[PDB]
Amino acid sequence: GEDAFRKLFRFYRQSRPGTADLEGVIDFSAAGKGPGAQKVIKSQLNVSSVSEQNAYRAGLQPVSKWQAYGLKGYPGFIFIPNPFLPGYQWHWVKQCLKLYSQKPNVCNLDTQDLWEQSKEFLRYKERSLLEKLRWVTVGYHYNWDSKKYSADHYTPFPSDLGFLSEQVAAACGFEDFRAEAGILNYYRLDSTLGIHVDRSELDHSKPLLSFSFGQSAIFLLGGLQRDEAPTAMFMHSGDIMIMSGFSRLLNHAVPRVLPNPEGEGLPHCLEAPLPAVLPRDSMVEPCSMEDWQVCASYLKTARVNMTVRQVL
Ligand SMILES: [Mn+2]
16 A cells, blocks of 8 residues: 555565565564564463363363564564364364354344255365354344344353453453354455554553464554554464453554465364264364365365454
């Protein structure tokens, strides 16, 4: 475009993956990028706020093994790399495609059953309801015209997703966090998310939690005004971003979902299977081969985002 954010947004939208174009983008998984990488600082977690039993029940590594980062100049911003136990990302992806999208919740659409159809479309050699799915709301449903939440329009918040969110929130120092409203977003390789501020509600003290699965994205985090040059960072599969306080007023964008380097394929962390024998006390359940096959085929050219907040 013209201004600093616009220039960087367009740069990354059009960049060539694999080349020196992405040398300035922060990769939190890899701990010499110039401005970007010098801003990276450790963000101290409240390790004792999440018991090993609770981490294991959510399908998470023990919090003592998590690495959390902040960025100098962006107070209230926390970036976790993938903390998920091997295999467990598949549970969340399955729940987002199969269960959470169903009509007890609201979705952009609202066989002929979505999951049964995609089961059959995979078998029928070479536009499905799953391919058309763009967003789903859970918990207190957001009204897109009303621009707010209401006690009349709600569904019980998925207890597995709520518990996961609250463990993450607790590790970040928000031990009283209540998962009450969620938006699930479904992106394609061509998907872009424009520069915006998440709309202002009086209290900004509670964290927004953002989970990503599937293909990697480039996220731009800017300033209070649109003109300030953003910092660029990767969001890889399993990574979690937490924004509270000051950071919730910042301009941000996702200019690019990056393809798998081989065109179509899955990130390395999704190669591990969900374990055969899960615990009895787990919030997670087994994933069937048939269900998995639909998830894998979908994720090869997609990114799923879950955004969780407290509204009351
Ligand atoms: Mn946003």
